[PDB]
Design a protein around this ligand. Structure first.
Ligand code: DQ2
Length: 340
C-alpha cells in the first residue's frame, strides 16, 4: 500500500499517482489518478473512530452528501474502506478535484465584479437546495467553498450541519458555539443556538463583504469581540430590534454600550456595485427575523443576470448527537457499504 508524506494512503488499485494537497484535524487530502474514469480526483483520508465527536461529524457529512445531488454542492464519488468493521481504521472520501477554494483565491486574487456576482449566485443557488432540505450548513466560510479551473463553485464540509429547529433556537447570553468565529451571526452571542436558516445567510453576507475587499469584514479575536466588530459597523440596534431580545442579560449587555453609528457600506466598499451593497445590507441585517432569506436573495436585482428559479432546484424531500463512538463506527460502515 503506497504512502504519502509520512503515513499510509491506501486507496488502490483504482486510484494511483498520489500527490499531497493538505491536512485538517485527523486526516490528509491528496490528489490521485482515477484509473477507471481517467481523471485526477481529490481523496480525503478520515481517521475518526477513537472519538464520538469525530465520528459524529464524519457520519453527518457522509449522510448529507450522499443524499444531496446539486451542481453547487460537492458530491461523494466513491468511498474506500476495508471490507469489515474490524479492519476498518480509516475511510477515504473521493470527490471531484477542485483547483482551489475561495479562501486561497482571496489571499492573492482581486475579484472582478462579474466574478463576485457569479460566485455569490452559485453560493446562494447551492444554499437554496440545502435549506430546501431543511438543513443548515452552519459553517459557511471561504475555505468551505471549492472552485475548479472554470470557476464552478461547490459548497463543502457539512460536518457541523444540522436539521433546522427554529422552535428550539433560544438560549442564554454568551452560550458557547462551535462554528467559525468571523462568520457567526450576532444572535449566536446573544440568544441563539444557530438552529435557523438565517444563521447561514449571515455567513454568506460575510463572504460577500470579503469578496468585495479581500479582507474579513468582522475579524473578531475571541467570542465577545466578534460582537463588537459587528456592532462597530452596523451601529447600535434599534429599539425594535432590542425588543425582540427578551433575554435580559443579552438585552442589558447591548443597552450598556455607548451609541455607535452605522458605517455606510459605500464608505467601507467605495468600488463596490451599488446593487451588491444593497444585497449585502439585507444579508447583514442585525435582526434575524428581518434578514433576507435565500430565495429572496436569489431574486435580488444584483443577481438578475443569473436568476432563474426553474434552474435553481430544491431537494426532493427534507431531512442524533448522543451515541457512543461504537454505534457510530457501525453507522459509518453501513453508510459506506454502497461503494463496495
Ligand atoms: N483538509 N484539508 N486540507 C485543505 C486542503 O485540501 C483541499 N481540498 C479539500 S478540503 C476543503 C474543506 C476544508 O478542509 N475546509 C477547511 C475548514 N473546514 N477538498 C478538495 C477537493 N475536493 N479538491 C481539491 N482540494 C481539496 C483544500 O482546498 C486545501 O487545498
Amino acid at each position: 500500500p503506497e504512502m504519502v508524506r509520512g503515513q499510509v494512503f491506501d486507496v488502490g488499485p483504482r486510484y494511483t499517482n498520489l500527490s499531497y494537497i493538505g491536512e485538517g484535524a485527523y486526516g490528509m487530502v491528496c490528489s490521485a489518478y482515477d484509473n477507471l474514469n481517467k481523471v485526477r480526483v481529490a481523496i480525503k483520508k478520515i481517521s475518526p473512530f477513537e472519538h464520538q465527536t469525530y465520528c459524529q461529524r464524519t457520519l453527518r457529512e457522509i449522510k448529507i452528501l450522499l443524499r444531496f445531488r446539486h451542481e453547487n454542492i460537492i458530491g461523494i464519488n466513491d468511498i474506500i474502506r476495508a471490507p469489515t468493521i474490524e479492519q476498518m481504521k480509516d475511510v477515504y472520501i473521493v470527490q471531484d478535484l477542485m483547483e482551489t477554494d475561495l479562501y486561497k483565491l482571496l489571499k492573492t486574487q482581486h475579484l472582478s465584479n462579474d466574478h463576485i456576482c457569479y460566485f455569490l449566485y452559485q453560493i446562494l443557488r447551492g444554499l437554496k437546495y440545502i435549506h430546501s432540505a431543511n438543513v443548515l450548513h452552519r459553517d459557511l466560510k471561504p475555505s468551505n467553498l471549492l472552485l475548479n479551473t472554470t470557476c464552478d463553485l461547490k459548497i463543502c464540509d457539512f460536518g457541523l450541519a444540522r436539521v433546522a429547529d427554529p422552535d428550539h433556537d433560544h438560549t442564554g447570553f454568551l452560550t458557547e458555539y462551535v462554528a467559525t468565529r468571523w462568520y457567526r451571526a450576532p444572535e449566536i452571542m446573544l440568544n441563539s443556538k444557530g438552529y435557523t436558516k438565517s444563521i447561514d445567510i449571515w455567513s454568506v453576507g460575510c463572504i460577500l463583504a470579503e469578496m468585495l475587499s479581500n479582507r474579513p469584514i468582522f475579524p473578531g479575536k475571541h467570542y465577545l469581540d466578534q460582537l463588537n466588530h459587528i456592532l462597530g459597523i452596523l451601529g447600535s440596534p434599534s429599539q425594535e430590534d432590542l425588543n425582540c431580545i427578551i433575554n435580559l442579560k443579552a438585552r442589558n449587555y447591548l443597552l450598556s454600550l455607548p451609541h455607535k453609528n452605522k458605517v455606510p457600506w459605500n464608505r467601507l466598499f467605495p468600488n463596490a456595485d451599488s446593487k451588491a451593497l444593497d444585497l449585502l445590507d439585507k444579508m447583514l441585517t442585525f435582526n434575524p427575523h428581518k434578514r433576507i432569506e435565500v430565495e429572496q436573495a436569489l431574486a435580488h436585482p444584483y443577481l438578475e443576470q443569473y436568476y432563474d428559479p426553474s434552474d435553481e432546484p430544491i431537494a426532493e424531500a427534507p431531512f442524533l448527537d448522543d451515541l457512543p463512538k461504537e454505534k457510530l463506527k457501525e453507522l459509518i460502515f453501513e453508510e459506506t457499504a454502497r461503494f463496495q
